[PDB]
Nucleic acid binder design. Structure first.
Ligand SMILES: OC[C@H]1O[C@@](CO)(O[C@H]2O[C@H](CO)[C@@H](O)[C@H](O)[C@H]2O)[C@@H](O)[C@@H]1O
Ligand SMILES: Cc1cn([C@@H]2CC[C@H](OC(C(=O)O)C(=O)O)C2)c(=O)[nH]c1=O
Ligand SMILES: [Mg+2]
Ligand SMILES: [Mg+2]
Lengths: 416, 554
DNA sequence: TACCCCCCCTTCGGTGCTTTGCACCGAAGGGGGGG
């Protein structure tokens, strides 16, 4: 007998109309079974072609999980739904979360199926299950309850959610809890044993509300306290060839857009003649200070580069080869909030696409913990290649935005 | 006494009204056959007569079925189309015979007069109103509205299609060991039942369908192979396409080539090895449909080779979920690739072709990867799984490519099939500068106004050259300068440019290009033994970069 | 003088860095096929 919270899209915007992409046999079977059980439970209901909206659906297995999990690509719906910040429903982000020694991620999306969804809004959650070899026309459902993956659902559920954790919070006031989409971020400074212990307590605690008023049991362990930054570094050599100094000058001249105090006059001089790339040339006394002075500048942080909560985050990724991937997170060009490098991820030396997928998931997770936002990615990959394979490797319950770029590496800038 | 199919609520686009488009002139013969069809629908209950109160008209016309005497009624509801609510189409793709498993017993039926057996939405009926001239505009004529889905309305296919699926629903749940492929009104029904128990189920199927107002005439009830279905012919252990009719005409236009090229595309799914590159080239240009086009020496050579494929009659087999899938690709030259999908040697499920040329400058490896991608996706549509690939590329070649390319790329489980012509990388730039090779600092500039330019280089041994260029651009001159460097150097060479543009193209190892100059550079690179390209920023007082920049700016 | 789906080949305009030229990509309009 619970009353539904009204929800409206942004004025001057239609609902989502995104085409369903082809699904493998195992994913459709999992989806048909899952949708059958959900329809029996009133969570969704069958609809026709007279609802003009559609949102792509597929299925995933989380890290080290053997049971299929439904995932809706609500990216389109999310960008068309009223921001609840204006409403004042939106969740605040705790600056302390990133400082805790252990942070466990719990899937709690299941809670959301308990809460009815506003009748007038349901039509926008329409999706179509496809069939192998098009044996059947698509089978369309829409949501009656709060769907996993929709940005409206954590917003609307917060009240019940705050009430549920309330006891646990008062008992353990040192523990940080952040809710992002279908996930709960629980951080503590406890020793590992008591941390996992406390997470189990919260989970059993969740069961007590579940009895009363994909699975809940899973948990992934982060350590935000140990998150490194990958800065810009110049090589160290006793002898420099013309080629080496050409690389160094191109690199320094590129870096200067980020650190303005960098100078290349003394270094550029060493290149006056038309000399062989392979020739060794001694650094002038003037040149050594300039190189040393630039190392000093690169050691210090950039000036006036801070997080603006109203601007979007952007992530760029470079493939460095030999399984190494670099990334930068920014809101304004050349004002990087974070830089980093990943190595030896799943797929190293055999699968670029799996590696990039892992990279994207890792970067998004860091962005959620640090800023409570997911960045928009600039991916170093052809669109067709990405769209063909990424869902085979996707293990997260959110999907960041992305676009495709093609930037040949002319300076080996973020990796030596 | 039928169970009527509940109607589907349909609205118009907000604040738009109904169509008011008066009938275009009907030539005498036309005016008559129409009148008799109308009277029929009224007797059947399919169309209501009322017209004082409905202000609306939509033009009507009629055209005959193909090779049939009969005349089929069409509505020009296109105005209603712009004004009607959008629909989400439930028809996502086309079934392919190579996705079917083998069935002991098979039936094919067509529902008769499909759209006219499904009731239009009650409230929407009034906008379907139309007017037919009684006797060449002597007296008013007769007004009518549709009671069922009218042909020509954008919501008619989707609505029929979705209703059909809800109707079949209880029959499927309670017969889970039957297979029904519904594509509009045409049904294929297959079972591993005895032709006795099968004929029963079919008749049970026909009954359930008639209970909801869906007729299945015997005239459309195919019972004996070869089954005519979706433009194919189904035999019990093999399928094939319904005959392809290729024009052999001596005079060719644009429109002939479109038709011609299209038919071959359609044939490529089972007749292996089809090529259309030369014929399609004969099409590129603003050339209008009527203008006549003589074939090329190499173009009618293509056409001849195709016929040789289509002489035999080819067939595919059906799918055995217990066996792996295999996709095999062959290089066909000039950016053409064919493939075969099969599970046992020479029993192809289907074939196809990929020939898309994307990018001004590309190579075979990218194109093969794209072809892998096309085949992978097509397979997920038809069988819901990715095939094992057999590809004409050395494992080493692939390793050198994907690990060195700066974009992420990948190919799923695959093995080398030693079938020339092999895909290979035609040259490799060195990673480090070459000791004892001459260093060439290249640069080029053009005048935006004159479009006159210069390209040249200076060298560490004193060698220099500058070439005047006419009718050119900055980016062209930059490529030109690298070309001169490659032309005038020995077998091993270091080249220093400041062209971000030029280095971008060359570093992706293209082997084919839309630019004559790029092909010329590619041709030079293949002959060399070691090439090291190096970029330096312009205007930073480096090297010969400042010494060659002043040559070709003044 | 119609509707809905899928496919390939070409052209063309919009978009963003390779910049004021050039490269990529999606839409649309031609063809094949289905009902
Ligand atoms: O890969 C992008 C590609 O996917 C599509 C098709 O569904 O859209 C999805 O991906 C976009 C990129 O993040 C999202 O913005 C969009 O909301 C989502 O549906 C295509 O639109 C797009 O080309
Ligand atoms: C060919 C064609 C068919 N249709 C409809 C699609 C489903 C209905 O079925 C038919 C039937 O009336 O029986 C059929 O069996 O072919 C007719 C069109 O609307 N426009 C068309 O050009
Ligand atoms: Mg029929
Ligand atoms: Mg210059």
């Amino acid at each position: 007998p619970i009353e539904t919270v009204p929800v409206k899209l942004k004025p001057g915007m239609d609902g989502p109309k995104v085409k369903q992409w082809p699904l493998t046999e195992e994913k459709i079977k999992a989806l048909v079974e899952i949708c059958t059980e959900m329809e029996k439970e009133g969570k969704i209901s069958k609809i026709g072609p007279e609802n003009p909206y559609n949102t792509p659906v597929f299925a995933i297995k989380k890290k080290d999980s053997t049971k299929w999990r439904k995932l809706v690509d609500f990216r389109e719906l999310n960008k068309r739904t009223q921001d609840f910040w204006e409403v004042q429903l939106g969740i605040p982000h705790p600056a302390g979360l990133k400082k805790k020694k252990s942070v466990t991620v719990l899937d709690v999306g299941d809670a959301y199926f308990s809460v009815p969804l506003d009748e007038d809004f349901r039509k926008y959650t329409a999706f179509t299950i496809p069939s192998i070899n098009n044996e059947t026309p698509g089978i369309r459902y829409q949501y009656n309850v709060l769907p996993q993956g929709w940005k409206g659902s954590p917003a609307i559920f917060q009240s019940s959610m705050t009430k549920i954790l309330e006891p646990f919070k008062k008992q353990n006031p040192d523990i940080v809890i952040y809710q992002y989409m279908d996930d709960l971020y629980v951080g503590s400074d406890l020793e590992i044993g008591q941390h996992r212990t406390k997470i189990e307590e919260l989970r059993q605690h969740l069961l007590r509300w579940g009895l009363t008023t994909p699975f809940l049991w899973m948990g992934y362990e982060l350590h935000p306290d140990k998150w490194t930054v990958q800065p810009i570094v110049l090589p160290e050599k006793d002898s420099w060839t013309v080629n080496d100094i050409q690389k160094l000058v191109g690199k320094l001249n590129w870096a200067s857009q980020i650190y303005p105090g960098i100078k290349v006059r003394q270094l550029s001089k060493l290149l006056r003649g038309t000399k062989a790339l392979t020739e060794v040339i001694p650094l002038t006394e003037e040149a050594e200070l300039e190189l040393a002075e630039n190392r000093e500048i690169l050691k210090e942080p950039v000036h006036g580069v801070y997080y603006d909560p109203s601007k979007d985050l952007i992530a760029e990724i470079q493939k460095q080869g030999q399984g190494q991937w670099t990334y930068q997170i920014y809101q304004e060009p050349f004002k990087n909030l974070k830089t980093g490098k990943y190595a030896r991820m799943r797929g190293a030396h055999t699968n670029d696409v799996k590696q990039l997928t892992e990279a994207v998931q890792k970067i998004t997770t860091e962005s959620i913990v640090i800023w409570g936002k997911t960045p928009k990615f600039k991916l170093p990959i052809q669109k067709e290649t990405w769209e063909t394979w990424w869902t085979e490797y996707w293990q997260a319950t959110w999907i960041p935005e992305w676009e495709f770029v093609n930037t040949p590496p002319l300076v080996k800038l973020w990796y030596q | 006494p039928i169970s009527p199919i509940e109607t589907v609520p349909v609205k118009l686009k907000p604040g738009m009204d109904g169509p008011k488009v008066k009938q275009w002139p009907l030539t005498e013969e036309k005016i008559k056959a129409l009148v008799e069809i109308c009277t029929e629908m009224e007797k059947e209950g399919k169309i209501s007569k009322i017209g004082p109160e409905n202000p609306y008209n939509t033009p009507v016309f009629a055209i005959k079925k193909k090779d049939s005497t009969k005349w089929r009624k069409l509505v020009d509801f296109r105005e209603l189309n712009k004004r009607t609510q959008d629909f989400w189409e439930v028809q996502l793709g086309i079934p392919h015979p190579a996705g079917l498993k083998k069935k002991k017993s098979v039936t094919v039926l067509d529902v008769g007069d499909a759209y006219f057996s499904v009731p239009l939405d009650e409230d929407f009926r009034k906008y379907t109103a139309f007017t037919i001239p009684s006797i060449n505009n002597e007296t008013p004529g007769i007004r009518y509205q549709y009671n069922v889905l009218p042909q020509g309305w954008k919501g008619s296919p989707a609505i029929f299609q979705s209703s059909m699926t809800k109707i079949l629903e209880p029959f499927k749940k309670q017969n889970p060991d039957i297979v029904i492929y519904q594509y509009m009104d045409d049904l294929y029904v297959g079972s591993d039942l005895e032709i006795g128990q099968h004929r029963t189920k079919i008749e049970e199927l026909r009954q359930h369908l008639l209970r909801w107002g869906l007729t299945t005439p015997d005239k459309k009830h195919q019972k004996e192979p070869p089954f005519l279905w979706m433009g194919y012919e189904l035999h019990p252990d093999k399928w094939t396409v319904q005959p392809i009719v290729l024009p052999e005409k001596d005079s060719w236009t644009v429109n002939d080539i479109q038709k011609l090229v299209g038919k071959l595309n359609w044939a490529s799914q089972i007749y292996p090895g089809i090529k259309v590159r030369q014929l399609s080239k004969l099409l590129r240009g603003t050339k209008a449909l009527t203008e006549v086009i003589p074939l090329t020496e190499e173009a009618e050579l293509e056409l001849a080779e195709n016929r040789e494929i289509l002489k035999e009659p080819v067939h595919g087999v059906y799918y055995d979920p217990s066996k792996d899938l295999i996709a095999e690709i062959q290089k066909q030259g000039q950016g053409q690739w064919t493939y075969q999908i099969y599970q046992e040697p020479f029993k192809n499920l289907k074939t196809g072709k990929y020939a898309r040329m994307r990018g001004a400058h590309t190579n075979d490896v990218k194109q093969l990867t794209e072809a892998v991608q096309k085949i992978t996706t097509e397979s997920i549509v038809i069988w819901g799984k990715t095939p094992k690939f057999k590809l004409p590329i050395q494992k080493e070649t692939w390793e050198t490519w994907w690990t060195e390319y700066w974009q992420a790329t990948w190919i799923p489980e695959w093995e080398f099939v030693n079938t020339p012509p092999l895909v290979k990388l035609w040259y490799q730039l060195e990673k480090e500068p070459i000791v004892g090779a001459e260093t060439f600092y290249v640069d080029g500039a053009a005048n935006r106004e004159t479009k006159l330019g210069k390209a040249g280089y200076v060298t560490n041994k004193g060698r220099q050259k500058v070439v005047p260029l006419t009718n050119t651009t900055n980016q062209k001159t930059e490529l030109q300068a690298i070309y001169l460097a490659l032309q005038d150097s020995g077998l091993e060479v270091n080249i220093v440019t400041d062209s971000q543009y030029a280095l971008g193209i060359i570093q992706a190892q293209p082997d084919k290009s839309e630019s004559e100059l790029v092909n010329q550079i590619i041709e030079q690179l293949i002959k060399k033994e070691k090439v090291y390209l190096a970029w330096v920023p312009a205007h930073k007082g480096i090297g010969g970069n400042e010494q060659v920049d002043k040559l070709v700016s003044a």
